[PDB]
Write a protein that binds this DNA or RNA. Structure first.
Ligand SMILES: [Ca+2]
Ligand SMILES: [Ca+2]
Lengths: 152, 152
DNA sequence: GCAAAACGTCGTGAGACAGTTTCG
DNA sequence: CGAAACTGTCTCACGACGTTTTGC
């Protein structure tokens, strides 16, 4: 449980509400008990020419990594234990993304107990349904409705 | 001289490096001693549905206004005296737009002294030439080189 | 003459995903 | 079977300007 500075979290909080993104997805995968994977990721996008800023995040936050995708670069943090630790300390300073942040935290908490019941998985599959609305979604496909392919 | 909260500044700073934009322009206007106006402006843009955040900024920052422009809305601060006071307080916490913040501040200071010498005005038109380089410009027209219409 | 407000839009820099592969 | 990586992309939501008008 690595603890972060308050001035660090305050700034970042504003930058996250700015260019950050708190994604939560249900990815269809046959290798999973319920045919879908619950992906949770914290993104931070920026012009590759400004990648150094992204790289600096991997150092300051501790975990995570930075991917390159042409003209733009993202800083990705998908590791659940660390991510839950980050959003726990960050959540109190967010103003725009503070709802999804706490939703993602909620999902992480119920992830183990959602691997058991098909009814719970579907309910957690609903939390993410909420995050997507709160975000500015436009290219979403796999929703909790489709996850009801459980009826077999 | 209104003093802003340190935590308000810490958060806003990240958000400014996020969705904000510190601009400086040279607008061709015949009504001016040198045919050009030195326009300075602090912008903050968000989806019109998230405008409420911009209206909140008008309260917290004390000055400024919010304009509508379709799907998007901007919070604009163009007043010199209050702007200078705001950036002077914000500058230390910025991380991506600190250079331009200060350049703008440099400009404001030498604004009344550039209204006099066509040489001073051409030098300041240069500070702004620097801010644009620092920003992600791609629609710029009137630069200091063009300001050299002073050759009459 | 000039500070500041109006008003319009080019071209992305981003948000928010998707789909597939790897690893243990 | 799952956590987490790797790879790809639609559609903006933004940045950063430009032109014109106030009115004192
Ligand atoms: Ca944004
Ligand atoms: Ca940005």
């Amino acid at each position: 449980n690595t603890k972060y500075n308050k001035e660090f979290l305050l700034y970042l909080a504003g930058f996250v509400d700015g260019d950050g993104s708190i994604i939560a997805q249900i990815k269809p995968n046959q290798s999973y008990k319920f045919k879908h994977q619950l992906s949770l990721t914290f993104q931070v996008t920026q012009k590759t020419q400004r990648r150094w800023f992204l790289d600096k995040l991997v150092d300051e936050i501790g975990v995570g990594y930075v991917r390159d995708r042409g003209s733009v670069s993202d800083y990705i943090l998908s590791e659940i234990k660390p991510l839950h630790n980050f959003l726990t300390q960050l959540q109190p300073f967010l103003k725009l993304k503070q709802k999804q942040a706490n939703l993602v935290l909620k999902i992480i908490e119920q992830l183990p107990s959602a691997k058991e019941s098909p009814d719970k998985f579907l309910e957690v599959c609903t939390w993410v349904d909420q995050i997507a609305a709160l975000n500015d979604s436009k290219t979403r496909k796999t929703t909790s409705e489709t996850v009801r392919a459980v009826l077999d």
